[PDB]
Design a protein around this ligand. Structure first.
Ligand SMILES: O[C@@H]1[C@H](O)[C@H](O)CO[C@H]1O
Ligand SMILES: O[C@@H]1[C@H](O)[C@H](O)CO[C@H]1O
Ligand SMILES: O[C@@H]1[C@H](O)[C@H](O)CO[C@H]1O
Ligand SMILES: O[C@@H]1[C@H](O)[C@H](O)CO[C@H]1O
Ligand SMILES: O[C@@H]1[C@H](O)[C@H](O)CO[C@H]1O
Ligand SMILES: O[C@@H]1[C@H](O)[C@H](O)CO[C@H]1O
Ligand SMILES: O[C@@H]1[C@H](O)[C@H](O)CO[C@H]1O
Ligand SMILES: O[C@@H]1[C@H](O)[C@H](O)CO[C@H]1O
Ligand SMILES: O[C@@H]1[C@H](O)[C@H](O)CO[C@H]1O
Ligand SMILES: O[C@@H]1[C@H](O)[C@H](O)CO[C@H]1O
Ligand SMILES: [Cl-]
Ligand SMILES: [Cl-]
Ligand SMILES: [Cl-]
Ligand SMILES: [Cl-]
Lengths: 131, 131, 131, 131, 131, 131, 131, 131, 131, 131
């Protein structure tokens, strides 16, 4: 067995190919996935796994230089919005309209679907560099 | 969005094709997957999701006529062994040696990998019929 | 066997991947299917299954926020036009010319072909969200 | 549009390649489909389409020289057992145990899944020749 | 064996998927086939099969709404040109320059190559509707 | 255009790869095709193209060292049986039961389906060598 | 074995699909091949096979109506330039700059790589028609 | 970028899928790779990378329960044989003849080719379990 | 461009993957190629390229450990037989019956077709090791 | 085994297809790889293989007519910037902004990932010609 890194086999393969500026998406159960973008569905049931649990694991296994989210999250999901601001305190966090956000997901290497059943609980993690 | 059934998109597709006697495997993080058998990895980190949570969701979404498990589970994982006996009280539960168990997984339609980090926490669910 | 959700295996797989705003098409026996769009043909013979039977089952298994149809349906197929109004009384219904309608089918995740042999008996169901 | 023959596009493609002795299977909603065998699911809901309706359409679009069903159908599904005898008057009807029946389906060019929710409502149609 | 419809298996598959306005092309031995368009070659030797024989069969198995040919056919192949006018008396026959004709072939579902060794013996059949 | 050789593009490709002892099959409209063997269907309608016309073209474009046919052809299809004897007078002709003939088609590089509607009008052409 | 036509199996397949105006390229060892264009490499070692030998065989097996070559060939490779003029005296020969020549290879059905080690020893053969 | 685990992207994907008892092979530049086994070639030039460098990195990123090597390594490659003994001092090391060794490579998930130019410098690492 | 090694791109790819004991076949124009074995056809016309020319090039670019040919070559092709003996003076040359020779070709990584039009001008080159 | 040329099997296949002006990229561990471009990862651990070592091997196995690097390398990576100037003395070295550089990589036939952990250690080698 693999000794280090993320436990999920599908996710390990995606992280392995990440280069500077590549993007991956963490999404709630309702975000549509653009045609041609790989979808890894980790959901089991509503709320499992949660957006917070998934984002935390990725933050620990991936070098993130920037986080992108939809402005709407501040209005309909303060709970998760705060979590995001706290988790990525050192990184740059940009808010765009949800419409623009969706547009940006077309360039993602993958969309990770969580079981999160709350509004606009989605974010784009942009890969940094280790040197 | 889909109104009923299992939330996970990968799993929904597998359940959709199940016919009487078809088998699927729920497995801990260490079970090897036979070549040619589809692998759906739901693990996020050790213990998430747990064997119990995964087995419970499947029991509710799939008609199971028989459950197969390795005798070794009774010796090294009484906790999960009891859970299994309780969850599938109405179904037939058969214990085989772990070696035989692995052999049977070659005929499964899929292996669902959980984040369970305890010994022999694996079982084979054999599909029943609705009429 | 799968206990909940739509009975058709091909359809279950499509519903499983629907995200907010994704579209699927229910078509009569004559609608052309754009290249690149998956076609699931349920027809057996003229009139079986009917547009009404198909649309009703889908309404029960999918959360629809908007319905789109060709304006020509009102004048050439009153029975079915009324059926739609009644079935999706709570959703927004939009009428476009058949020409524009056909153009929209290019973005659909799938086209479900029925055995319907009456004019303009087609519609686009746009997925809503569960939270 | 195609003027003659069966309406279903998927089925038309299967019938087109049929040669003397090739086999296709008409199945109820529970029959498991062997790996590698093409599956065409026409089901919409329990009981639609019915085994009888599907078998009737195939009978008039395909030259059948022999029908094969499971003996169990005579005891558990007398109504559909009679339908077959009546529908395939001139053809040779052979009965086998359900187990042997399933073995034969591995050689089928395709399995057509109906919405039939009654025990052992399955049969294999063996293609005849037109000269 | 298949009881009704066109005898050729490849062609039956093409006709089965035809929807209103879909196009197929019947070509002589020299017409180039655009990249991406399926080619079904029925030629055996020069003159076999003939343009006329192939067109006659398709006219009988397909609902033709409109026929398109190159104006050059009237100048260099009056024999086949007259044939076309008579075979499709009831349908609309449009003449375009051979150059425009070729551009339209790129939208066809298939090109059927015949053994015809006479100039401009090509035509596009546009599918109609059965209701 | 290609100046020499067989006119049919599909067949030209198969002949191009023939080595000493490779086999191709010419079949009537009813011969079943083993799974995995390429099928090139040249049929248009019953009797077109005929078994005789197809065999004659192949004989002229391929170096045949041996011909294999079913014994049943001599009694059930005298006309074609005589034709085969005349066309391949130089080569060795071997007659096997039809059942044994069919097993042999498993090793063929391709089965050419003709429009022939007369019994046992099939034969295997075994490639010879040009030096 | 195939009695007539070009000996190379790869090339025989390309010639079989040629229609009026289709193009194939004969190249020296250095010509780059555009992505998506089939490359058939016949080279063995420098000078084997030569540009001249390859062009001569193709000229005898393909109906060429036009030849296109880079203007630079006349000054940098006089020997081959003369050869091209002699071999294709009947057909139309057009000279374009090498850069423009390369853009043209994008539309070729295939690039045949020879062992030629002399500059600008490339040419495009445009298919003619046999009637 | 991925923060933890093995640096090589191809290798990370292989490690991610390892289950208990799965095998991977580290090979010198001359070992033949069985058909069907994925080959990841890390060689740059003779001696780079070395067997020792490769084996050491893998030992750090993978939980190995058993090592298998060819007995011939002890006599023909003492330096490397000793290196293995030392590196995997805590694991079980099994020596088979090179012939039997090669047979075992057929079951490997992958063969990692190094730039090692010394005799029998190959080994099979058998994955252990983390709990 | 590639500076060193064999000039042919297809062949370079085959040589690159060769491991100790791997086999490639050099064949005359009539040798049949087993299903599943890659065929690289270098033939242009009869006699070009010659068996001798092709074998000479491979001998120079590949480390040959053993050579296998059919005994029949000594009887019907003494010229090429002597060539082989001289070219591979240092290597082991084994003669088997042509029938056994053919069975061994099924294990080859590739068959290289030459333009050789003389009997039994075929041979299997078994790869050696560079250390 | 292959006697001459680069040792890496993956790289050998890429070099084999190189034509005049084709490009390959040598990258550090952080460079993102455009979609559709082949990625060959040689990295083993940070610093192995090094940018210099990889570039040196490619230089002697590939005819390079022009090198392209990012201007940023001169300021952030002076050591590797000098290496390049020194290694490619005769070749033309062009510098562009890192952004323009990345755009050019979309046209590369492949990206070779090294274990180089230093800023802007990337370069594009443009293939020259051998005559
Ligand atoms: O689920 C997503 C969003 O988070 C929001 O709920 C709107 O619909 C989808 O786009
Ligand atoms: O992880 C599984 C078992 O559950 C046990 O831990 C032994 O190794 C694997 O087969
Ligand atoms: O069948 C469809 C329509 O419903 C109408 O019948 C016109 O032709 C097709 O576009
Ligand atoms: O559904 C089929 C049978 O008809 C019976 O119900 C038993 O299970 C399946 O094999
Ligand atoms: O064969 C076709 C035409 O019918 C005409 O002969 C001109 O060349 C091809 O385009
Ligand atoms: O069509 C073939 C035979 O020629 C015969 O007609 C019997 O059925 C098929 O096997
Ligand atoms: O090899 C070709 C040309 O013939 C010329 O040598 C220049 O480089 C390539 O484009
Ligand atoms: O390279 C391998 C071995 O390590 C040994 O060198 C013999 O040849 C191959 O099998
Ligand atoms: O061409 C080959 C042989 O070399 C011999 O000519 C016999 O036929 C084929 O098997
Ligand atoms: O790794 C590369 C560069 O060399 C630099 O480190 C910036 O990120 C990537 O583009
Ligand atoms: Cl990892
Ligand atoms: Cl479902
Ligand atoms: Cl039909
Ligand atoms: Cl090489």
């Amino acid at each position: 067995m693999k000794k280090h890194g993320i436990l999920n086999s599908h996710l390990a393969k995606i992280l392995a190919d990440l280069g500077h500026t590549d993007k991956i998406v963490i999404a709630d159960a309702g975000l549509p996935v653009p045609d041609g973008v790989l979808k890894i569905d980790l959901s089991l049931k509503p709320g499992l796994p949660a957006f917070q649990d998934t984002a935390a694991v990725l933050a620990e296994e991936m070098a993130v230089e920037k986080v992108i989210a939809a402005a709407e999250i501040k209005a309909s999901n303060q709970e998760n919005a705060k979590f995001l601001e706290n988790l990525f305190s050192e990184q740059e966090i940009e808010y765009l309209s949800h419409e623009e956000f969706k547009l940006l997901t077309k360039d993602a290497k993958a969309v990770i679907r969580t079981g999160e059943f709350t509004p606009y609980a989605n974010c784009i993690l942009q890969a940094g560099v280790l040197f």
